Amino acid sequence: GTSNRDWWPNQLDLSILHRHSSLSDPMGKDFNYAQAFEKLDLAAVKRDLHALMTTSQDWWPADFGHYGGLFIRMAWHSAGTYRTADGRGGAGEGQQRFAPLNSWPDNANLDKARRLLWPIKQKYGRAISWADLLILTGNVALESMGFKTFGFAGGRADTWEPEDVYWGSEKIWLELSGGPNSRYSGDRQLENPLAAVQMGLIYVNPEGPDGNPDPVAAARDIRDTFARMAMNDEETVALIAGGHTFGKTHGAGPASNVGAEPEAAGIEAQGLGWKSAYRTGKGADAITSGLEVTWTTTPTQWSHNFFENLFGYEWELTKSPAGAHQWVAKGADAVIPDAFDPSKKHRPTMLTTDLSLRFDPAYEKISRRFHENPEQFADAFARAWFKLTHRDMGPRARYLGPEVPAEVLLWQDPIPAVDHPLIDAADAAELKAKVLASGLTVSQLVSTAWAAASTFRGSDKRGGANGARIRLAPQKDWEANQPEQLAAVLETLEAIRTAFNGAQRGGKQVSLADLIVLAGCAGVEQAAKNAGHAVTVPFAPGRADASQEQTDVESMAVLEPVADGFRNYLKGKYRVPAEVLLVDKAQLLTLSAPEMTVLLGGLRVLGANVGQSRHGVFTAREQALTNDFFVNLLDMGTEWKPTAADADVFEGRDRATGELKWTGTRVDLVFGSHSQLRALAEVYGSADAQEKFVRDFVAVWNKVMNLDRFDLA
Amino acid sequence: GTSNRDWWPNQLDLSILHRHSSLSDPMGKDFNYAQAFEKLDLAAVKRDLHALMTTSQDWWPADFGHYGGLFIRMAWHSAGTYRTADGRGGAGEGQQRFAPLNSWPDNANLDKARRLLWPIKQKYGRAISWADLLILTGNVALESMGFKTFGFAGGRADTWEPEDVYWGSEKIWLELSGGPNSRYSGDRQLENPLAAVQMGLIYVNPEGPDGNPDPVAAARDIRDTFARMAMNDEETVALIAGGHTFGKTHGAGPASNVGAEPEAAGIEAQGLGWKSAYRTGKGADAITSGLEVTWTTTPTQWSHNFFENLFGYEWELTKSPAGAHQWVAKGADAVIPDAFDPSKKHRPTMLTTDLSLRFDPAYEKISRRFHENPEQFADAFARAWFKLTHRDMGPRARYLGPEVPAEVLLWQDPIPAVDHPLIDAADAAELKAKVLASGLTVSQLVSTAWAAASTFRGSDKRGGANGARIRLAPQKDWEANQPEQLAAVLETLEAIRTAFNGAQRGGKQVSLADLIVLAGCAGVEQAAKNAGHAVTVPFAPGRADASQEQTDVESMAVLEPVADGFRNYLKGKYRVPAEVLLVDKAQLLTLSAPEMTVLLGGLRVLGANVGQSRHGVFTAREQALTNDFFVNLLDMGTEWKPTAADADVFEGRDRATGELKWTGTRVDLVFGSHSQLRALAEVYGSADAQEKFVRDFVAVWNKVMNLDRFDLA
């Protein structure tokens, strides 16, 4: 069946803006997962998970009689798709159970792990999500094996279809670099937003870069990919050594024995894959990665044996039974237990990437410190495991249940508690009147609140207006935020705040975070008045101001917009057409196609463009809230052509006279070109639509202002 | 960006079940198009359209100063995608303005036609849909040129994204037959459900079959394609001759002058396409099909000059300026006017397909009759034009506005008016108790109501339980409906009806259509009671009973189910896997993936399978409404394998003992295989789900029972 995607493979794709439809969701529209979880007997779940650890099934027998290692890998893989570039991937939506991740080569036999959890999932139902269960099971496996976790939060709601994530352009699983769709260029530079070295891997190749077993060069890939998953050197070494304190790899025979991944298998496989023709196909005969390594002398118990072995032997390159590169300890005794036969023992072995922890000079110092001070190792691993598995959960207000750690961590972008009465409706009206009497314009008010609130992304629930981080490094210096203009707006708002607060009794005060948003609202109200309409913009107080010391400047840098079509901003020239980047931004903001359309049209006419560009400002009453953008964009009296200087800028000329009327970018004109977007523009550009446009704009504005308000949720 | 579709190109596609999401729709969730349309000043819209017909724009100058011909073609193309096999295509959703239809080669330059209508669309806004406007504009063009139309109904609500229709497998626009993706096999047999001879055409090739200019062979393709669009010989001749009474074709220069279709054009083209480098690129220089034919001496006025010319001359094969085959009248005077230069005149010309009307012997008799009696021609054309443009609108209750024809047509599957008081809630309870006391079983009641209601398709809004046509030819004899069993159920229900009706006062009575549905509701209530649950199934009376004389048996044939996964029924062996045919059926019934899942699971355990098959009946309490289907399907203690006799049947055996537990088809087992469907099955298979399962089943049952109840809209 030939599709639109076949005929027009480069056309913009809007279906990413309608994932999460209530059509695909089997739960009612009223279903609230937080409420269901808050009633779960989490202790009873943990008991059942503890019992499962040593209840082996014959269809996938447990190594050493304990599934703990398999479950820790399962949980680590669930979390470990996360990229800081866009916040996509991670454990927070339980995407491992959907395509493509359910069938990535690095997730081989994790299908079996998930199937082992079905009885517990079934027993507790909607009160524990898959997303939550995968992480909890990891935690319980650590606890069962003697490792004390830092804590656990529930609240990851299940999703019901695959997310549309760009995982790379390769058309071959695991393709080595330098191919026609290479994710690498120059001096081994991995393309943004990717955070893995080959298609279908979590981070790096365990044999070494493109299969070359050099631990020093592997270290480099490790450092790069883990950084792109938010982990520094200390966290990286704690995580790899911590994880590889447990379990084993599986490579008992050649990989050609292993069949179709889950999405390719026959219907009788009932959702599982990688069925193996090698001997029994499972347990002692299991093939997963092709490597055959067991790290420690007690694979089912926490120990300090990983670094004892790593440092205590010299290592020799060898091949697994499947042909994969790995390392064996020179002249060692057979001290490592077999997973199934008590009469067999094996020599200590390591992956190339394990040897990275010793042969990379910066890692070596941390590894040695961990070897000498195992308590520091244990604490760092517990902290990093918590971060890894919670990284995409958003503000602390979303964390549920009785095991949430009390300690506030820098990486959580923490927001101070509010400890004073909030402003009421009379106070809000007063503050808005002061904002308007100060001289701040519609365009300054709208631009500043947009800048503050539009850093939110729904992928990892970072960003937004709460915190007033727009006043701090690095947001106050971002080019998209117009630093000089921003400084002047914030100075006026700070004076308004200080005066209001000094005049109060009873300890009432307004935060700068709330005042930025409230001022934006006054600007939209003023804009509506300029167009002759009476409009009230909703506003919810309660934001607090975070400090500079609560704001990790390096972690904040990935939220910088390099493309924001809502302000007609592009920081440089890119591979990706500007309209593709607009739809990507709309997705992160959680907007539908109609919301994206109304929002952009209104922002153009309010003066939200960076640098006061005229591009797309298709109105003769700028700073008035009208549907002019749509009426003028759709006017057939105007003809459009790319400019000589720049093919991404267009001139719109009167068709009869030739006179220049407007200019726009690709972000502006795609609303007059794409057939679905132009259908949306037509609604808002019709003669009966002025009121609908205002209403719908105010709604989406308010939506964006509240994206991070999980304290109200 | 590599996608799931790239990695697993043959995996089932569920996204067809979630078009029409409220995410993509810009109108509020409360927007009711019928209400908006009913207040439109339709007379004022027709006046504006009338003025438009002679107001030429320089970007697309009007032939002969009159846009009427172009707008007729536009409206005919809007309707003429319709196929009777599935009811897909047609004008009823305004899909011509979306991909792919907006960019089909046969819709070349209809983008200009739609753009000419934007000012009127903009003026009237949401009170007239694009879908309605396209057809109305065709009508007004006919009227302005002296043709009396049969009427017009509004009510086609706009859609906001492309429908996913199978239009064929070719990867090249207009590919000639016999390629690697040939839509032809055998003795020129066109594959179901297609209704055109080449990808991107409306019906046939105007040069002749695969471009061979033989009018006799072309007649064959015409007859075949038109029949697949529900038009017999009489209607076909009326339509082609009627349309070709007006306007002209466009082929002033070689086709290689013409650029990118709209979906491939640059952004500056603002949604138009086919920009031409030939001379001015428009008007006198226009190129559309590459043919250059003007059929009549008054291309802007209704006449009987098409048949005068067809029969009054002999015809010679010739080539247009673009190289296309066409026909010119041997030795005729230049009597046909030029579209732009009053000083030029041309000879009469014809398409190969026009000559079909004369050289096919069956067409010739009709064409002669129409030539001799042009009043008969006019009436036939008006009736056919009404049918063509309304064929997918569904029951007469959906027809809006003041120009709806009063004559009831057999093709409308008409339903008699109700002229008596309806049963009330107490009556419905009494009738249900009588149905259950008669001895009819849960399985008979469910099966019979399913058979009656499930003929509905949302594509053209034909079918459903209204009318009680299940008791008539041909439905009563369809294999899926189990004719002997059906006859026995109907006999009992008719006696119940006769006794209830005879006992009433005051004219109150119950139709057999309503009693079939009500009995099915009693069966579902009894099934819930058998499982230990008291529920009431909603029921809305008001259906009526149509007669055999009001039922066109040949037109009803395309509604026969040859694949009904909901009854585990496949009438023969097909190309298409049975699970693909299930999702196709779900789409026609307007179900989401969750609705499809619940509905199938419930029907299995209620005994709805054809022939009392055990396949998928995964319960030991058949006729009780439980979630047993899902609990047993998902039980990992069972292992499944295809049988030796049949690869499409599977045995489910105890994993430990090998004992046979169940059998099922691909339709049953897909719910345990497909990653998104298994996630849905898990919800309904969980321990907390029995009440959700019953509630959701009752709701989808009721939805299916009411699919054709546009009387209650």
Ligand code: HEM
């Ligand atoms: C550079 C990073 C890493 C690489 C290249 C890597 C590679 C692998 C490979 C190839 C396996 C064998 C899969 C199999 O054949 O069954 C595996 C197993 C495992 N990894 Fe990692 N790993 C990495 C980091 C991690 C981290 C961060 C954790 C957890 C905190 C982790 C925990 C595990 C565990 C528990 C297993 C054993 C599974 C079992 O017993 O079935 N690894 N690792």
Ligand code: HEM
């Ligand atoms: C065998 C069936 C049909 C064939 C092959 C066919 C073919 C065509 C072709 C090739 C053109 C020229 C497109 C261009 O270059 O501008 C055209 C024009 C036209 N056709 Fe048809 N036609 C068919 C049936 C119909 C029917 C059923 C109607 C309406 C009842 C219709 C009405 C028209 C009109 C009005 C035009 C003139 C367009 C203008 O003036 O711009 N045709 N036809």
Ligand SMILES: [Cl-]
């Ligand atoms: Cl994601």
Ligand SMILES: [Cl-]
């Ligand atoms: Cl359709």
Ligand code: NA
């Ligand atoms: Na994420």
Ligand code: NA
């Ligand atoms: Na249709």
